[PDB]
Amino acid sequence: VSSTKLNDLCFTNVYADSFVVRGDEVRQIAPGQTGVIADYNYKLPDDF
Amino acid sequence: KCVNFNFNGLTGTGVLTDSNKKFQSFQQFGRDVSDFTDSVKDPKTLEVLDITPCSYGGVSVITPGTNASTQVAVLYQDVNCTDVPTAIHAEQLTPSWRVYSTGTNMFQTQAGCLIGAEHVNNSYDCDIPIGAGICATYHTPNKRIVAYVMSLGAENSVAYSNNTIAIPTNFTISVTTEVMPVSMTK
Amino acid sequence: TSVDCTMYICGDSVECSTLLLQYGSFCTQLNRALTGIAVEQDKNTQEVFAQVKQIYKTPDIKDFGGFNFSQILPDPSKPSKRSPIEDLLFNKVTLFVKQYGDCLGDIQARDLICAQKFNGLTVLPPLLTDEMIAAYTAALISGTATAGWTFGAGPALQIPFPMQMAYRFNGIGVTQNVLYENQKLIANQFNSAIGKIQESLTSTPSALGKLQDVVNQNAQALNTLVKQLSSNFGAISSVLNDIISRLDPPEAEVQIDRLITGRLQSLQTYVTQQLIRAAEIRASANLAATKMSECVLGQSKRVDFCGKGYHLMSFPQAAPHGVVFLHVTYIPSQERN
Amino acid sequence: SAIGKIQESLTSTPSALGKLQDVVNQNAQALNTLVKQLSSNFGAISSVLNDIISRLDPPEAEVQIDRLITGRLQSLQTYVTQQLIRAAEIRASANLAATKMSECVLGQSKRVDFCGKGYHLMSFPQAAPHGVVFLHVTYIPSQERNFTTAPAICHEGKAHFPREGVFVSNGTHWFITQRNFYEPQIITTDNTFVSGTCDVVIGIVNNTVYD
Amino acid sequence: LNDIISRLDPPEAEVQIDRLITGRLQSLQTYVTQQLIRAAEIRASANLA
Amino acid sequence: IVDAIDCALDPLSETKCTLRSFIVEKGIYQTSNFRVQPQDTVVRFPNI
Ligand SMILES: *[C@@H]1O[C@H](CO)[C@@H](O[C@@H]2O[C@H](CO)[C@@H](O)[C@H](O)[C@H]2NC(C)=O)[C@H](O)[C@H]1NC(C)=O
Ligand SMILES: *[C@@H]1O[C@H](CO)[C@@H](O[C@@H]2O[C@H](CO)[C@@H](O)[C@H](O)[C@H]2NC(C)=O)[C@H](O)[C@H]1NC(C)=O
Ligand SMILES: *[C@@H]1O[C@H](CO)[C@@H](O)[C@H](O)[C@H]1NC(C)=O
């Protein structure tokens, strides 16, 4: 979904996942990322 | 009316009308085999609305050629002459189009409503084929576009009898031309 | 068939229609090809049925030297000009023609024909009506009954039907006396053979399978083209509105382009298939026109061209999207060494 | 006079060679459409390959060039299929023309309406751009007269049938004539054959068949 | 196909597989149209025979 | 630019735009829809 279109859209269900990571590990919170966080803590689906 | 619509995030262009369709408890929209959204539940009134394409009917324009005239006749396919203004949304159209939404020259054919052509009871050879036996021509009734049932040919009754024969007493040598393509550009 | 290319590929989307313009003349070429096929179909019918421009009036009596044409001629005192056999032929081929409101108030009445119309797919009516084609076949048969084979070479020349049959017999190497001495037997055999044709089609279906196959093929081709709109062709959705509502122009254009390419290819496949089928039908129509000229307007000596056996005469009967020829032939039946 | 009328029939009235002009127009239109398809971008940033190569590096340029290659290859593939379809329609016309050359020019046709309308006598071929024009010479009956007729003539108790032609009565006398041209000839035992008796033929008439 | 699936994850592999599907489907579609054209030329020869 | 056509002006203008030709020969032409364009936007979201 494009961020600019979020204000024009409606969603059937919305889930909010919340956690704390180090600054250099924020890149791992994205599909197809490899790293300590992406591998053993929090993985997103590739079709997220 | 033809409008751009946005229902709960779902956008599109079409005419919104009252629907007799019934929706399931949580259904918000309906789709057909083509995956076209044909219906939507209004999130405020909970009323089901049909969504029709802004122009789904076929429109044919009949012209005697721009070199001969700028006059044109318009055929609305599978539409009754009474429904043409609603079918083509004439109120949202230019004054120039509204002239072809109604008029004294409106003839219903099996092919649809023809507007802009004068219907005649005379039968002629087909010039511009419209369909369902109807053809149009730029005849002089100022020249005007005229619509008519096409002629199948001249009538002839053979006088059949059990004891009469017709024998030719003379003949004519005729030469006819047959044109046949043989090759195309290599 | 007629196709509105923009309504099929982009529906009412201005964003998709602007992208479709980048493909150039593909849509216009597709429409020109379908328009050529539509004109060829009217030309096919004209070549087969409109060979004689003289509409010989149906004779009041359908009896000629004992030969009964009542089953192949217009019905007496009937404003429509369809023959009893033709009435059946039309009833054996099952067939679009929906009016403007027929697709509006549909409660769970979704039909493939409405989906065809809402996606730019239209069926054009033929130029010649079924009644006009029945008038041509009635004129050809009426001419044959009275004039003979002369109305296809110049002035219609009246001849008694028995005498016309005597000429046709001497054509197949049988002396005219054989016809005159056995006139009542030959007339009875002809009348019985025409009567057997009524049931031969009525009693046994699949008689008009060649005509039904043409109708079934066209229906299947249009239904396949409509169902191709549900394919995503590698896009995130088959619905243009879902792509435009969730993505911004730069990313939406990539997804819309995948739909435009797949839908344009579906339509291009359909048009090539229709052109192939159109020539096979053109070839059948040219053969039918040749059989109308040689089997109906004349007497054929070409073996197995106008039916099996020695060809005497043929009568055309109108049918949906086609013609049925009734070939009258002489067949030797008993032999002695 | 008929050959002379052919000169004007084409000269005075145009559209006589429309079938040949249509083949030329179709080919020209197909080639012009194929050239104009090069101005389409097919989803690429430009229809000009040089604009893509000059502004983008190979990895990004290849994606844009691939969109042009696919659209141009499809334009060319559409053109070739269209040309093959047109080529067979012309092959069919050429095979029919070759058959008409063999049957209408090298022979005399009895096939109705194959070599022109009327009774075919002879045909002459004329060369034309991308095609052939046949001049079909035909015999057409022009004037006709109604006569009383009979299937057979009854002499004594013998049924006489015409060997060729048909029995016709001018009003008082019976004669035999050929079917396509009125030439009354006295009924003799040379222009008739005897089969059976006068009691079997319906409509037989009594007359004198001399020798 | 196996080289694409073994080296790329589904989101990136699908883009490469789609390019192969489109090219192979077009190769097969070209073949079938060619065969139909040849089939009628042979049908015409068979009808003449 | 030597000439121009408003495709939504009249049926002849629409025929010219459909055929992409300023000259139209004698005949009947099925035209692409070019006369109806939405003039209003309808936005309907729930009572939240
Ligand atoms: C959302 O609220 C509107 C009112 O703002 C509701 O619609 C009104 O309902 C009342 C009571 O039935 C009617 O008298 C009004 O005519 C309605 N319209 C307006 C403009 O006031 C509407 O039903 C609500 N929707 C939902 C789903 O609760
Ligand atoms: C030609 O044949 C038909 C069929 O036998 C004849 O008409 C039918 O005759 C039967 C027997 O009298 C009737 O029961 C049917 O109702 C008739 N059908 C119709 C449509 O009339 C017909 O009379 C014959 N014609 C001639 C001149 O002999
Ligand atoms: C037959 O036709 C020719 C050519 O028109 C004419 O010269 C001739 O006089 C005609 N004969 C009769 C008997 O009418």
Coordinates of C-alpha atoms in Angstrom, one line a residue, chain B residues 2 4-5 9-15 17 19-23 27 29-39 50-58 60 77-80 83 86-89 108 110-111 126 128-135 149-168, chain C residues 4 7 12-14 42 46 52-57 59 61 63-65 96-101 103-108 110-112 114-120 122-129 131-133 135-136 142-143 145-147 155-163 226-227 229-231 238-239 241-242 244-245 263:
Chain B
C2 CA -21.6 9.2 -14.1
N4 CA -16.1 9.1 -9.5
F5 CA -17.0 7.1 -6.3
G9 CA -11.6 2.9 0.2
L10 CA -13.0 1.2 -2.9
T11 CA -12.8 3.7 -5.8
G12 CA -14.2 3.7 -9.4
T13 CA -16.3 5.5 -12.1
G14 CA -19.9 4.7 -12.9
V15 CA -23.6 5.4 -12.4
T17 CA -28.7 3.3 -8.9
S19 CA -30.4 -2.1 -6.2
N20 CA -32.9 -4.9 -5.8
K21 CA -29.9 -7.2 -5.1
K22 CA -29.7 -8.6 -1.6
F23 CA -26.4 -8.7 0.3
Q27 CA -20.9 -8.2 2.4
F29 CA -19.6 -5.1 -2.4
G30 CA -20.6 -7.5 -5.2
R31 CA -18.6 -8.6 -8.2
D32 CA -19.4 -10.6 -11.5
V33 CA -17.4 -13.3 -13.4
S34 CA -15.5 -10.4 -15.1
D35 CA -14.4 -9.2 -11.6
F36 CA -16.4 -5.9 -12.3
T37 CA -17.8 -4.4 -9.1
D38 CA -21.5 -4.3 -10.0
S39 CA -22.8 -3.3 -6.6
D50 CA -26.0 -1.0 -8.4
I51 CA -22.9 0.3 -10.2
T52 CA -23.3 0.5 -14.0
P53 CA -20.5 1.5 -16.5
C54 CA -20.8 5.2 -17.6
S55 CA -21.2 4.0 -21.2
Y56 CA -22.0 0.3 -21.8
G57 CA -24.5 0.6 -24.7
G58 CA -23.0 0.6 -28.3
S60 CA -23.1 3.8 -34.1
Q77 CA -28.0 -0.3 -30.2
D78 CA -30.6 -2.4 -28.3
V79 CA -32.0 0.8 -26.7
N80 CA -35.7 2.0 -27.0
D83 CA -34.7 5.4 -23.0
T86 CA -31.1 8.1 -19.8
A87 CA -29.0 5.4 -21.5
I88 CA -26.5 8.1 -22.9
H89 CA -26.8 10.5 -19.9
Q108 CA -37.3 2.3 -33.7
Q110 CA -34.7 -4.2 -34.4
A111 CA -31.0 -2.8 -34.3
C126 CA -28.9 -0.8 -49.8
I128 CA -25.3 2.3 -46.0
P129 CA -26.2 -0.9 -44.1
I130 CA -27.6 -0.4 -40.6
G131 CA -29.0 -3.9 -39.9
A132 CA -32.3 -5.9 -39.5
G133 CA -33.1 -5.1 -43.2
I134 CA -32.8 -1.3 -42.7
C135 CA -30.3 0.8 -44.8
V149 CA -36.2 -1.1 -45.7
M150 CA -33.7 -2.4 -48.4
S151 CA -35.2 -3.9 -51.7
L152 CA -34.5 -7.6 -52.3
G153 CA -35.1 -7.1 -56.1
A154 CA -37.9 -6.6 -58.7
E155 CA -41.0 -8.8 -58.5
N156 CA -41.8 -11.2 -61.4
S157 CA -44.7 -13.8 -61.6
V158 CA -44.0 -16.7 -64.0
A159 CA -47.3 -17.6 -65.8
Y160 CA -47.1 -21.4 -65.2
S161 CA -49.2 -23.7 -67.4
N162 CA -49.3 -27.5 -68.1
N163 CA -49.4 -26.9 -72.0
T164 CA -47.4 -23.8 -72.6
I165 CA -43.6 -23.3 -73.3
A166 CA -41.7 -20.0 -73.9
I167 CA -39.0 -20.4 -76.6
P168 CA -36.4 -17.7 -77.4
Chain C
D4 CA -14.7 -1.7 -27.6
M7 CA -13.7 -0.5 -22.3
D12 CA -13.9 3.6 -17.3
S13 CA -10.4 4.2 -15.8
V14 CA -8.8 7.5 -17.1
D42 CA -23.1 -10.2 -44.8
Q46 CA -25.5 -12.2 -50.2
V52 CA -31.2 -14.0 -58.7
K53 CA -32.5 -10.4 -58.2
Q54 CA -36.0 -11.4 -59.6
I55 CA -38.3 -12.4 -56.7
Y56 CA -40.5 -14.9 -58.5
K57 CA -43.9 -15.0 -56.7
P59 CA -47.3 -20.2 -57.2
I61 CA -50.9 -24.3 -56.2
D63 CA -48.6 -29.3 -57.3
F64 CA -46.7 -29.7 -60.7
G65 CA -47.5 -32.9 -62.7
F96 CA -26.4 -11.2 -27.8
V97 CA -29.8 -9.4 -28.2
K98 CA -30.4 -8.1 -24.7
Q99 CA -32.1 -4.6 -24.4
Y100 CA -30.7 -1.7 -22.3
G101 CA -32.8 -2.5 -19.2
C103 CA -28.9 -6.0 -17.6
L104 CA -30.0 -3.2 -15.1
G105 CA -32.5 -4.7 -12.6
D106 CA -30.7 -8.1 -12.1
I107 CA -31.1 -9.5 -8.5
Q108 CA -28.6 -12.5 -8.5
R110 CA -25.9 -12.1 -13.4
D111 CA -25.6 -13.6 -17.0
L112 CA -22.4 -14.0 -19.2
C114 CA -24.5 -8.8 -19.5
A115 CA -20.8 -9.3 -18.5
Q116 CA -19.9 -9.3 -22.3
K117 CA -21.9 -6.0 -22.8
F118 CA -20.4 -4.3 -19.6
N119 CA -16.9 -5.1 -20.8
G120 CA -17.2 -3.7 -24.4
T122 CA -21.3 -6.4 -28.7
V123 CA -23.1 -8.6 -31.2
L124 CA -24.1 -6.9 -34.5
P125 CA -27.3 -8.1 -36.2
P126 CA -27.0 -9.5 -39.8
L127 CA -28.0 -7.2 -42.7
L128 CA -30.4 -9.8 -44.2
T129 CA -33.3 -10.8 -41.9
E131 CA -37.6 -13.5 -43.6
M132 CA -35.5 -11.9 -46.4
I133 CA -33.4 -15.1 -46.7
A135 CA -37.9 -14.9 -49.6
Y136 CA -34.7 -15.6 -51.6
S142 CA -40.6 -21.0 -57.4
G143 CA -38.3 -20.0 -60.4
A145 CA -40.6 -25.1 -60.5
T146 CA -41.9 -22.9 -63.4
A147 CA -39.1 -21.5 -65.5
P155 CA -35.0 -14.6 -69.3
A156 CA -37.1 -17.0 -67.2
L157 CA -38.8 -19.3 -69.8
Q158 CA -42.0 -21.2 -68.6
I159 CA -41.9 -25.0 -69.1
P160 CA -44.3 -27.7 -67.8
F161 CA -42.6 -29.4 -64.8
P162 CA -42.9 -33.0 -66.2
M163 CA -41.1 -31.7 -69.4
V226 CA -14.7 -12.1 -20.6
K227 CA -13.2 -14.7 -18.1
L229 CA -10.5 -10.2 -17.2
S230 CA -10.3 -12.2 -13.9
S231 CA -6.6 -13.1 -14.6
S238 CA -7.1 -8.3 -11.6
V239 CA -9.2 -5.3 -10.5
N241 CA -9.6 0.0 -9.1
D242 CA -7.8 -2.1 -6.3
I244 CA -5.2 2.6 -8.3
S245 CA -6.8 2.9 -4.8
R263 CA -5.8 -8.1 -21.6

